[PDB]
Design a binder for these strands. Structure first.
Lengths: 52, 111
DNA sequence: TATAATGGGAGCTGTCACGGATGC
């Protein structure tokens, strides 16, 4: 995970940091021999696009 | 070499989808699915094999197959896609037959 | 027209008398 934009509010002896974060969460899929992959390596997908 | 279940299903699928591609392509072009099939087959196999087919209404020669292939190359991207599908299909077919040639021997040795 | 099945067998043996072609 990486921090894109960082905002800081000073309150008392402390700071409250609002962090805009961008990261990636992995999800595995198991391909059976009767199935074929419709997507290349490292291609970008959206909601509704078919991987397999 | 002998096909794994995966390789087999892949080749089979490519063949079937290839036939479908030729059909859709005939719908688009308005040509004869047979003539189209023979042209795609011709280009896959090469000019090494070119001969007039009895079912065809036209004499099949490199001139006519070049005319037809050029009219196939003039299609829009989404339509010209089906050509690549067809070619892939034919290649898959050849590799399938060549792959399963052993079974024929094993069956015929009993005859 | 659909379980899956993926490389074949029989040879066949007591003649020389060689001719020209082919081989270290």
């Amino acid at each position: 995970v990486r921090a894109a934009q960082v905002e800081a509010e000073e309150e008392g002896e402390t700071v409250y940091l609002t962090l805009f974060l961008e990261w990636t969460e992995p999800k595995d899929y198991r391909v059976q021999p009767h199935m074929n992959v419709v997507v290349p390596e490292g291609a970008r997908v959206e909601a509704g696009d078919k991987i397999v | 070499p002998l096909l794994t279940l995966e390789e087999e299903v892949e080749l089979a699928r490519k063949v079937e989808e290839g036939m479908e591609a030729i059909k859709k392509l005939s719908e688009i072009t308005g040509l004869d699915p047979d003539l189209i099939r023979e042209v795609v087959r011709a280009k896959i196999l090469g000019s090494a094999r070119v001969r007039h087919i009895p079912g065809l209404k036209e004499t099949l020669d490199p001139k006519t197959v070049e005319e037809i292939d050029q009219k196939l190359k003039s299609l829009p991207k989404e339509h010209k896609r089906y050509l690549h599908i067809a070619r892939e299909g034919e290649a898959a077919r050849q590799h399938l037959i060549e792959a399963n040639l052993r079974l024929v021997v094993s069956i015929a040795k009993k005859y």
